[PDB]
């Protein structure tokens, strides 16, 4: 028998009543949300680095101003997500420390390097594109604070995704060298963007509980398919290609059928062995450690 | 029209170069809130640069903010030496910011009464932002100088290390003076009293000392820069130099 | 001819990029003697870059060492990821140098028996220099690791921090393999035993530890670089990008 | 009456017998040579910085290789000069410390910034040019170790001066932008190069004793005139100008008559208030302090 507390919760979930910070929740539900919201928050912070790599080099003042706004918005999004995680009783400072130590994750996508300006527009387009699909799907996540954080964030983020696409369009309509730059950035970021949706549905340990508890409203594979279906026509609009020999339209199902993800790479990446894992965490550790005297100054001044 | 163009460009270059510096902080700050704040200030200043440079390009009758930012070399750039100083540690960034913000506040307050309508409008926008910048920079000056023993020393060192470049803030050449007599520019020498009243009080309140060194470094306005500017521009202009004359 | 050109270019790029890094040390070293030594090594490596790049340009039938160094972007550069690492502290510079020198010694020893006469000659010159480089880098590894408690830790940290990039030293692609079967290139996988016998002994003698992390980072040879290379090139190529096609 | 020791010395100087480290010398002669050789040595070290500023940016590999060799030679020259100063009983480590603290000087010329590649060729041409005139004049300086150090050094240095001139020639024969770059570098470095010869002959406190003791063989003004006479034709060969409205040939004397030096600037510069004084000493202090652990490692390892 479920306990009365357990049963009431299951019934609240079934009726789509938002769970709030003061409501009883299964300890495993509390913890998987600290895990997920916390790693979502971590991702906004680490996500500043690949794009921020190009702030000082951005080719026009307009694109530089857009990128600066976008990196600022990401920081703001991290803050919203940390607040939401804290409603579950964890501490921002503690989960951040776990992030720095490698005991909590952040999104696989931020372990890829920005090797050209085109990469910046491609991140805004594909990476924010994948984020938005995931996040809009989460606007009906069962935990109130999380769902409301997704609402606040998607409003701002869809703007920046459009700006990244427009930056891609300029390259697509520009010189031959610009077109080539764009294609190369797509070739390097396409599969990494698809991996943001997580593992396949039968290699996904958190899904059974997350789906049942309506944390996850659509399966990783469902969201990934939706992203491919939505994004392929945008690739076409740019006159570009996808690095996928197996991508084709299936008239019978109404979906794009696409190639197999390199799951061996994905497992390397999420376990700290991707292209930039070490550099990303080093930069964040360096910021934290070198900033210590500033945080201590702030605390010591507040007290006086 | 040449003088007005050069004057406008100077104000643009200050904002552009300082914006570049603040850009380097993205994701490297002591707290997420400071990351946010520094990026905000960077963004405001870049907005001001675009405004000033756009007007300078319109004044010269050719080019735009991008030809100006990306196709001039360090002998043509006319920013203050102060804004090109490296970020160093957080105190160094705060000292540079506080000195510039106090100056921006004093300047834009007066330049919003410029007989040049575009200069007046640009300054009316900028002043509102500089006031936000000054609250933040003065705030941190006070938190660090009157923080710990260690932050107090770093903040004193930061002030000492930048002081010599403050002379340029009140340096007037014949562009300044001529435009000031037409009621168009602000004569930088007449900014000293307001800048000093602000900065001396802020340093005092932070429990710090005004340096006794007489500030002596100028040349930025004339394209005579420290060795810092060249590598900044090499980084800022790279892609435009590689792929000139394109749309982005 | 395409494979040989790419292979030659890789060896050039390694020497070029590492030379650039050593250049940054000029006048910033712990002792005047180290300033001298680092500049000497920088100079040797640049000499090797010119040799390899000149031959690559001759192989391609167009351009020269300057078109190659200054007009390629980071996706075309083919240096090892190791040589593009920042200088960091003196231990970091010494670790990077020791790993590369040990590798250069093992490589040039074998490449001087290349069935390609120009490759053989270039390697015959380079080997004599790499031997000098290795004595100096191994010398400092030992002095620092078996110096003070503090230098011992910095040297261990330096080794740890660069280790993951050592995998590329023994990475073979089809250019390596195809040229090696024609007796032209050295198959990098067969360099492991000599590099490890040298490096493991040097680390041991310095009273330090070989990292237990399995090295896993490659991509430099394919133009897939760390985020360090771009800003290096922005600085290295600036003047040529601004003023292309000139004589200097 | 001079003492017998004092008289023998005066006689040795008159007969041009080189003074050696074990010979008696007036204490003021010992000290002015520690002053001068030491500041000469300091200059080689600080002199690495303005040129070294351009090593990573040099426009061709050939010019980059030349500059690297040249900066290396300078370091070597510092070493020779420190050895020579030590024969007088001072310690390299102590006079270097005095340099870092601002209690000993180095050449005024190294407080000027390199703002373009042309500045590098101009330094090799004008700055080494002025150094060579000074140093060749010192090959008959009365103190043996100093004179022999000048012999060793001028051999290597005249090569690099020629290379700097050749770098200037390439710009002079190049595009319009290159020609302009060259002229601007000359405009900025001409007067600073002339100031390397020191103050005028009636504003020069060390000359009376230095000339008498045959430390200085030609007056500051004599050497400066010789440099102007030798260099003006080289400016002509480049098709360039000198930033001197008062420069003209005087057929009657056989010399170029040239304008007044800005002595107010010169006094600002040598007293630490030039364009790069602070940056130069900061870089050297930073190198010294950050290098401390390396020097201590080396000492502690040697002892074991
Ligand atoms: C879908 C999933 C990521 C994973 O499904 P779950 O059911 O939770 O897990 P599942 O059992 O399926 O997986 C097995 C294990 O591996 C995990 N893992 C899977 N995939 C990844 C991955 N790709 N990266 C790293 N780890 C991954 C997973 O955590 C689990 O390990 P764990 O048990 O935790 O140790 C879910 O957590 C979610 O939707 N999170 C919220 C979205 C979010 O975090 N967005 C942030 C990026 S967007 C952004 O920052 C905006 C932006 C754009 C541009 C620039 C700047 C900013
Ligand atoms: C001619 C003079 C410099 C000065 O005559 P004296 O009879 O000694 O003094 P006098 O009474 O006339 O002057 C009053 C005071 O001010 C001094 N002062 C004057 N001028 C300068 C000045 N320009 N900078 C700074 N200080 C100056 C003087 O020391 C005295 O102060 P003190 O009482 O010491 O506190 C003499 O010392 C000499 O020939 N030295 C050897 C040459 C040498 O040092 N060469 C190094 C540069 S070349 C190189 O490094 C190669 C290279 C090229 C390119 C790149 C890299 C490397």
Coordinates of N, CA and C in Angstrom, one line a residue, chain A residues 45 48-49 52 55-65 68-69 71-72 75-76 79 92 117 170-171 175 177-178 181 284 287 291 293-298 300-301 304, chain B residues 16 20 23-24 26-33 36 39-40 42-43 46 50 65-66 69-70 90-91 140 142-144 146-148 151 154 235-236 239-240 243 246-248:
Chain A
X45 N 24.9 28.9 -16.8 CA 26.2 29.5 -16.3 C 27.3 29.1 -17.2
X48 N 27.4 30.4 -20.8 CA 27.9 31.8 -21.2 C 29.3 31.7 -21.8
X49 N 30.0 30.6 -21.6 CA 31.4 30.6 -22.0 C 31.7 30.4 -23.5
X52 N 30.5 33.5 -25.1 CA 31.3 34.7 -24.6 C 32.7 34.7 -25.1
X55 N 32.6 37.4 -27.8 CA 32.1 38.8 -27.6 C 33.1 39.8 -28.0
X56 N 34.4 39.7 -27.6 CA 35.4 40.6 -28.0 C 35.8 40.6 -29.5
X57 N 35.4 39.5 -30.2 CA 35.7 39.4 -31.7 C 34.6 39.6 -32.7
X58 N 33.4 39.8 -32.2 CA 32.2 39.9 -33.0 C 32.3 40.9 -34.1
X59 N 32.0 40.6 -35.3 CA 32.3 41.3 -36.6 C 31.6 42.7 -36.7
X60 N 30.5 42.9 -36.1 CA 29.9 44.2 -36.2 C 29.5 44.6 -34.8
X61 N 29.3 45.9 -34.6 CA 28.8 46.4 -33.3 C 27.4 45.9 -32.9
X62 N 26.5 45.8 -34.0 CA 25.2 45.3 -33.8 C 25.2 43.9 -33.3
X63 N 25.9 43.0 -33.9 CA 26.0 41.6 -33.5 C 26.7 41.5 -32.2
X64 N 27.6 42.4 -31.9 CA 28.3 42.4 -30.6 C 27.3 42.8 -29.5
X65 N 26.5 43.8 -29.7 CA 25.5 44.2 -28.8 C 24.4 43.1 -28.5
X68 N 26.0 40.3 -26.3 CA 26.2 40.8 -25.0 C 24.9 40.7 -24.2
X69 N 23.8 41.2 -24.8 CA 22.4 41.1 -24.2 C 22.1 39.6 -24.0
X71 N 24.1 37.0 -23.5 CA 24.9 36.4 -22.5 C 24.4 36.9 -21.1
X72 N 23.9 38.1 -21.1 CA 23.4 38.7 -19.9 C 22.0 38.0 -19.5
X75 N 22.6 34.6 -17.8 CA 23.0 34.8 -16.4 C 21.7 35.0 -15.6
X76 N 20.8 35.8 -16.1 CA 19.5 36.0 -15.5 C 18.7 34.8 -15.4
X79 N 19.9 32.6 -12.6 CA 19.4 33.1 -11.3 C 18.0 32.6 -11.1
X92 N 21.8 27.2 -3.3 CA 22.6 27.6 -4.5 C 24.1 27.4 -4.4
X117 N 33.1 32.8 -36.0 CA 31.9 33.6 -35.7 C 30.6 32.9 -36.1
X170 N 22.3 36.2 -42.6 CA 23.3 37.1 -43.2 C 24.5 36.3 -43.8
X171 N 25.1 35.3 -43.1 CA 26.1 34.5 -43.7 C 25.6 33.7 -44.9
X175 N 28.9 36.4 -48.8 CA 30.0 36.0 -49.7 C 30.1 34.4 -49.6
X177 N 32.8 32.8 -48.8 CA 33.5 32.5 -47.5 C 32.6 32.5 -46.3
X178 N 31.6 33.4 -46.3 CA 30.6 33.4 -45.2 C 29.7 32.2 -45.3
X181 N 31.6 29.2 -44.0 CA 31.8 29.4 -42.5 C 30.5 28.8 -41.9
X284 N 35.4 28.2 -14.7 CA 34.5 28.5 -13.6 C 35.1 28.4 -12.2
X287 N 37.3 31.5 -11.8 CA 36.4 32.7 -11.5 C 36.0 32.6 -10.0
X291 N 37.8 35.1 -7.2 CA 36.8 36.0 -6.7 C 36.5 35.9 -5.2
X293 N 38.2 36.7 -2.5 CA 38.4 37.9 -1.8 C 37.3 39.0 -2.0
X294 N 36.7 39.0 -3.1 CA 35.6 39.9 -3.4 C 34.4 39.6 -2.6
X295 N 34.0 38.3 -2.6 CA 32.9 37.8 -1.9 C 33.0 38.0 -0.4
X296 N 34.3 37.8 0.1 CA 34.6 38.0 1.5 C 34.6 39.5 1.9
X297 N 35.0 40.4 1.0 CA 34.9 41.8 1.2 C 33.5 42.2 1.3
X298 N 32.6 41.7 0.4 CA 31.2 42.0 0.4 C 30.5 41.7 1.7
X300 N 32.0 41.0 4.7 CA 32.6 41.8 5.8 C 32.1 43.2 5.8
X301 N 31.8 43.8 4.7 CA 31.3 45.2 4.6 C 29.8 45.3 5.0
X304 N 29.4 45.3 8.9 CA 29.7 46.5 9.6 C 28.6 47.5 9.7
Chain B
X16 N 33.6 52.7 -26.7 CA 33.9 51.5 -27.4 C 35.0 50.6 -26.7
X20 N 34.8 47.0 -24.8 CA 35.6 45.9 -25.1 C 36.1 45.2 -23.9
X23 N 33.6 43.4 -21.8 CA 33.3 42.1 -22.5 C 34.1 40.9 -22.1
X24 N 35.4 41.2 -21.8 CA 36.4 40.1 -21.4 C 36.0 39.5 -20.0
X26 N 32.9 38.6 -19.1 CA 31.8 37.7 -19.2 C 32.1 36.3 -18.8
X27 N 31.5 35.9 -17.7 CA 31.7 34.5 -17.2 C 32.9 34.3 -16.3
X28 N 33.6 35.3 -16.0 CA 34.8 35.2 -15.2 C 34.7 36.0 -13.9
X29 N 33.5 36.5 -13.5 CA 33.4 37.4 -12.4 C 33.3 36.6 -11.1
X30 N 33.5 37.3 -9.9 CA 33.4 36.7 -8.6 C 32.0 36.1 -8.2
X31 N 31.0 36.7 -8.7 CA 29.6 36.2 -8.5 C 28.8 36.4 -9.8
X32 N 27.8 35.5 -10.0 CA 26.9 35.6 -11.2 C 26.3 37.0 -11.3
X33 N 25.8 37.6 -10.2 CA 25.3 39.0 -10.2 C 26.3 40.0 -10.7
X36 N 26.5 39.6 -14.5 CA 25.4 40.3 -15.1 C 25.6 41.8 -15.1
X39 N 28.2 42.9 -17.7 CA 27.7 42.8 -19.0 C 26.7 43.9 -19.4
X40 N 25.9 44.2 -18.4 CA 24.9 45.3 -18.5 C 25.7 46.7 -18.8
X42 N 28.8 47.0 -19.9 CA 29.4 46.8 -21.2 C 28.4 47.1 -22.3
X43 N 27.2 46.6 -22.2 CA 26.2 46.8 -23.2 C 25.8 48.3 -23.3
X46 N 28.6 50.1 -25.1 CA 28.6 49.8 -26.5 C 27.5 50.6 -27.2
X50 N 28.1 53.1 -30.4 CA 27.3 53.1 -31.6 C 26.7 54.4 -31.9
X65 N 29.4 53.0 -38.1 CA 30.0 52.6 -36.8 C 31.0 51.5 -37.0
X66 N 30.8 50.7 -38.0 CA 31.6 49.5 -38.3 C 32.9 49.9 -39.0
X69 N 34.9 51.4 -36.2 CA 35.4 50.5 -35.2 C 36.5 49.6 -35.7
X70 N 36.2 49.1 -36.9 CA 37.0 48.0 -37.4 C 38.1 48.3 -38.4
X90 N 39.7 42.4 -9.8 CA 38.4 43.1 -9.7 C 38.5 44.5 -9.2
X91 N 39.5 44.8 -8.3 CA 39.7 46.2 -7.9 C 40.1 47.1 -9.0
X140 N 30.9 49.4 -5.2 CA 32.0 48.4 -5.0 C 33.3 49.0 -4.5
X142 N 33.4 51.2 -2.2 CA 33.1 51.3 -0.8 C 33.2 49.9 -0.1
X143 N 32.6 48.9 -0.8 CA 32.6 47.5 -0.3 C 34.0 46.9 -0.2
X144 N 34.8 47.2 -1.2 CA 36.2 46.7 -1.2 C 37.1 47.4 -0.3
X146 N 36.4 49.3 2.2 CA 36.0 49.2 3.6 C 35.4 47.8 3.8
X147 N 36.1 46.8 3.2 CA 35.7 45.4 3.3 C 36.6 44.7 4.3
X148 N 37.6 43.9 3.8 CA 38.6 43.3 4.6 C 39.9 44.1 4.5
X151 N 41.1 43.3 0.9 CA 40.3 44.0 -0.1 C 40.6 45.5 -0.1
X154 N 44.0 45.9 -1.9 CA 43.9 45.7 -3.3 C 43.2 47.0 -4.0
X235 N 42.6 41.9 -31.8 CA 41.6 40.9 -31.4 C 40.2 41.4 -31.9
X236 N 39.9 42.7 -31.6 CA 38.6 43.3 -32.0 C 38.4 43.3 -33.5
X239 N 38.3 39.5 -37.6 CA 37.4 39.0 -38.7 C 37.1 40.0 -39.8
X240 N 36.9 41.3 -39.4 CA 36.7 42.3 -40.4 C 37.9 42.5 -41.3
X243 N 37.9 39.4 -43.6 CA 36.8 39.4 -44.5 C 36.1 40.8 -44.7
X246 N 31.8 43.2 -45.8 CA 30.7 42.3 -45.8 C 29.6 42.7 -44.9
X247 N 28.4 42.0 -44.9 CA 27.3 42.2 -44.0 C 27.2 41.0 -43.1
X248 N 26.9 41.3 -41.8 CA 27.0 40.3 -40.8 C 25.7 40.2 -40.0

